[PDB]
Scaffold this active site. Structure first.
Site, short mmCIF file in Angstrom:
data_model
loop_
_atom_site.label_atom_id
_atom_site.label_comp_id
_atom_site.label_asym_id
_atom_site.label_seq_id
_atom_site.Cartn_x
_atom_site.Cartn_y
_atom_site.Cartn_z
N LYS A 22 -3.73 41.50 68.74
CA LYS A 22 -2.79 41.58 67.57
C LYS A 22 -3.45 42.21 66.42
O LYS A 22 -2.83 42.88 65.59
CB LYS A 22 -2.07 40.20 67.09
CG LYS A 22 -1.25 39.49 68.28
CD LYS A 22 -1.19 38.11 68.10
CE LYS A 22 -2.32 37.28 67.77
NZ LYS A 22 -3.04 37.01 69.08
N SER A 61 -4.01 27.86 70.52
CA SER A 61 -5.31 27.42 70.35
C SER A 61 -5.96 27.07 71.88
O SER A 61 -6.64 25.93 72.00
CB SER A 61 -5.43 26.16 69.30
OG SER A 61 -5.05 26.84 68.02
N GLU A 83 5.06 35.53 64.73
CA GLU A 83 5.20 36.24 63.60
C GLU A 83 6.27 37.19 63.49
O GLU A 83 6.78 37.49 62.44
CB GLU A 83 3.88 37.01 62.95
CG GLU A 83 3.51 38.43 63.99
CD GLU A 83 3.36 37.95 65.29
OE1 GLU A 83 2.56 37.02 65.72
OE2 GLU A 83 3.45 39.15 65.89
N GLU A 101 4.74 28.71 72.82
CA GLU A 101 3.76 28.55 71.89
C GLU A 101 4.19 27.97 70.74
O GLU A 101 5.09 28.25 70.07
CB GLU A 101 3.36 29.84 71.54
CG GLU A 101 2.77 30.83 72.86
CD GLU A 101 2.11 31.84 72.22
OE1 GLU A 101 2.65 32.62 71.38
OE2 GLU A 101 0.65 31.76 72.22
N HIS A 131 6.78 37.13 69.72
CA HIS A 131 5.74 36.38 69.38
C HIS A 131 5.96 35.93 68.02
O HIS A 131 6.53 36.40 67.15
CB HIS A 131 4.45 37.18 69.36
CG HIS A 131 3.14 36.48 69.43
ND1 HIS A 131 2.45 36.22 68.12
CD2 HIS A 131 2.64 35.79 70.42
CE1 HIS A 131 1.29 35.38 68.44
NE2 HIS A 131 1.39 35.16 69.68
N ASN A 164 -3.64 38.64 74.10
CA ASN A 164 -2.97 39.09 73.34
C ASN A 164 -3.69 39.86 72.04
O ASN A 164 -3.76 39.03 71.14
CB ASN A 164 -1.84 38.13 72.85
CG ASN A 164 -0.55 39.00 72.30
OD1 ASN A 164 -0.19 39.89 72.44
ND2 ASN A 164 0.21 38.08 71.48
N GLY A 173 -3.28 29.78 65.92
CA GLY A 173 -4.20 29.98 64.71
C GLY A 173 -4.76 28.84 63.91
O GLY A 173 -5.48 29.01 63.04
#
Length: 237
Positions: free
Chosen positions: A12, A203, A87, A157, A85, A10, A163
């Site tokens: 981004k 991760s 964000e 997720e 996703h 993915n 991250g």
């Protein structure tokens, strides 16, 4: 047995290394049945599509929500999309219902959809993971008919794993994936639940992926567009 696994990269942000990396992917013999996916922002779709020729890979769009844009994507030969996703929800303000509407619109336009769900750190700590995650999937299900699930993939997720370098333990992943599958089995059907791919992301790396894949309810991964993605593919067997 498990349904066909998926390994999805993915992309981004930011800089397009994109050529040597695709060389690596194209040169990689994959010795088992797995659907590979490379998702990217709209402006990178043409470059990825021209360069990526490995037939186990498909290109995916992200975030499209307009019927005309979805039609144009399909016409360009893009058949997969990633929606919901992290964000999108916590920054851009996509509600459970906005993500659900996007999922339905994409399925209606002929896409395979990877729909993302997952809880925040505070929700996890407070014991709210189940109600949060199940409410997110419930919103998606309300806009779909049973036959539409052949076109859906769920990516679980935890936001706290994205991250941060804190991956879910195999136990944490398994417990979440089993919970999601149990809800699908009860609300949609055991037949649908058995075939549903539920991917883990947050991760994942080349070292930890194979252990996660050994869990009963894990059917693959959402990961970054990086050289170690080849090892993540290998981890799905």
């Amino acid at each position: 047995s498990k349904p066909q696994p998926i390994a999805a990269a993915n992309w981004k942000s930011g800089s397009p290394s994109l050529s040597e990396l695709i060389d690596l992917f194209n040169s990689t013999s994959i010795n088992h049945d797995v659907q590979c996916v490379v998702a990217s922002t709209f402006v990178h779709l043409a470059m990825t599509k021209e360069r990526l020729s490995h037939p186990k890979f498909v290109i995916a769009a992200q975030n499209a929500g307009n019927a005309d844009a979805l039609a144009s994507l399909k016409d360009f030969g893009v058949n997969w999309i990633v929606l919901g996703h992290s964000e999108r929800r916590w920054y851009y303000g996509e509600t459970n219902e906005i993500v659900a509407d996007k999922v339905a619109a994409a399925v209606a336009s002929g896409f395979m959809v990877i729909a993302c769900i997952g809880e925040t750190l505070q929700e996890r700590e407070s014991g709210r993971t189940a109600v949060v995650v199940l409410t997110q999937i419930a919103a998606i299900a309300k806009k779909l008919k049973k036959a539409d699930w052949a076109k859906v993939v769920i990516a679980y997720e935890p936001v706290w794993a994205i991250g941060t370098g804190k991956v879910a333990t195999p136990q944490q992943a398994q417990e979440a994936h089993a919970l999601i599958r149990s809800w699908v089995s009860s609300k949609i059907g055991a037949d649908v639940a058995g075939e549903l791919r539920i991917l883990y992301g947050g991760s994942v790396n080349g070292k930890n992926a194979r252990t996660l894949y050994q869990q009963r309810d894990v059917n693959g991964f959402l990961a970054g567009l990086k050289p170690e993605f080849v090892d993540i593919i290998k981890a799905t067997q």
